[PDB]
Design a protein around this ligand. Structure first.
Ligand SMILES: O=c1ccn([C@@H]2O[C@H](COP(=O)(O)OP(=O)(O)O)[C@@H](O)[C@H]2O)c(=O)[nH]1
Ligand SMILES: [Mn+2]
Length: 304
């Protein structure tokens, strides 16, 4: 029931009904046909295949696909066909979800940082940053002053949005009116998995430290948390909110590292003095029926 790293933390359990989430954002939506699925299934990176094998095993659980891009009408009929083929699979589109509660004008972020740096003496200020901040503020003369819109290219286009979907979590399926959603409530969460994370066998009920757990891709001795696997027990889990606060306050903040990785370290007060490897062990989404980071022994779907 309870675990610990620096204090006693309440391990949380997840109804197998806990849904799983896959995300595909395609910049060139034309590289594929205008009647077949706009998801990549290369012999080097078979993602739609992996997202379909996963659905076949956890049929009881819901499996969803958060997708975005200027797709063709025939490509839309294609996802609907997957929805008919598998009731397990529900495809959600960024256009059908409101993230307005998760946003902050780019203007404020800069002016707040500018005020803070201005307060301190000029000796203690960061001239470079204030220069960067003042330049960027003027260059938002374009009508768009929204952190969300700013995150529209493609690394950011999806990273920030992956975090925003997990902030909604189970609320995402409900907000999108995903039929077949007759096993989940509103505080439900969802487990995010890169599509190159292969589900060898049903995971079943899981236990996540302090109601949260994330994949940790350790290297030579060193270990690093990853946003490839995001397991939350409740929608709007507070670690993600801490990362959203970093997006709200920090300038040039990386959604991947400041949005989740740095947000998790605040929720558990890593403290730096404490060993990071063990803390990564403590946070580590562990599983034996999941093949983690397969693009790795094959190839990265992204040029960038
Ligand atoms: O055009 C792209 C490329 C990647 N992804 C997402 O990013 C994940 C990571 O892909 P991959 O494992 O190939 O990259 P890497 O592990 O090298 O970061 C994929 O599973 C997708 O969910 C996406 O949505 N669109
Ligand atoms: Mn990968």
């Amino acid at each position: 029931f309870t675990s610990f790293n620096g204090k006693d933390y309440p391990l949380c359990f997840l109804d197998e009904k806990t849904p799983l989430l896959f995300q595909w954002f395609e910049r060139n939506p034309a590289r594929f046909g205008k009647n077949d699925i706009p998801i990549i299934n290369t012999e080097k990176n078979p993602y739609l295949n992996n997202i379909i094998k996963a659905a076949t095993i956890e049929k009881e659980r819901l499996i969803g696909i958060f997708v975005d891009g200027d797709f063709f009408p025939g490509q839309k009929d294609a996802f609907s066909k997957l929805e008919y083929d598998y009731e397990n699979i529900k495809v959600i589109y960024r256009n059908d979800i409101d993230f307005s509660m998760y946003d902050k004008k780019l203007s404020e972020i800069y002016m707040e940082n500018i005020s803070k740096q201005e307060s301190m003496p000029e000796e203690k200020r960061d001239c470079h940053l204030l220069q960067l901040l003042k330049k960027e503020l003027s260059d938002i003369q374009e009508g768009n002053d929204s952190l969300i819109k700013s995150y529209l290219l493609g690394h950011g286009w999806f990273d920030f949005y992956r975090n925003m979907a997990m902030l909604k979590a189970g609320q995402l399926f409900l907000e999108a009116d995903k039929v077949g959603c007759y096993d989940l409530s509103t505080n439900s969460g969802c487990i995010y998995l890169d599509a190159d994370m292969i589900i060898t066998e049903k995971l079943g009920g899981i236990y996540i430290p302090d109601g949260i757990a994330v994949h940790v891709e350790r290297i030579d001795g060193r270990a690093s948390m990853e946003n490839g696997i995001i397991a939350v027990d409740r929608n709007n889990h507070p670690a993600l909110l801490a990362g959203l606060e970093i997006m709200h306050t920090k300038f040039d903040a990386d959604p991947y590292s400041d949005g989740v990785c740095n947000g998790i370290r605040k929720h558990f007060n890593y403290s730096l003095n404490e060993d990071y490897n063990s803390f990564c062990d403590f946070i580590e989404f562990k599983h034996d029926n999941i093949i983690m980071n397969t693009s790795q022994f094959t190839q990265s779907s992204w040029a960038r």
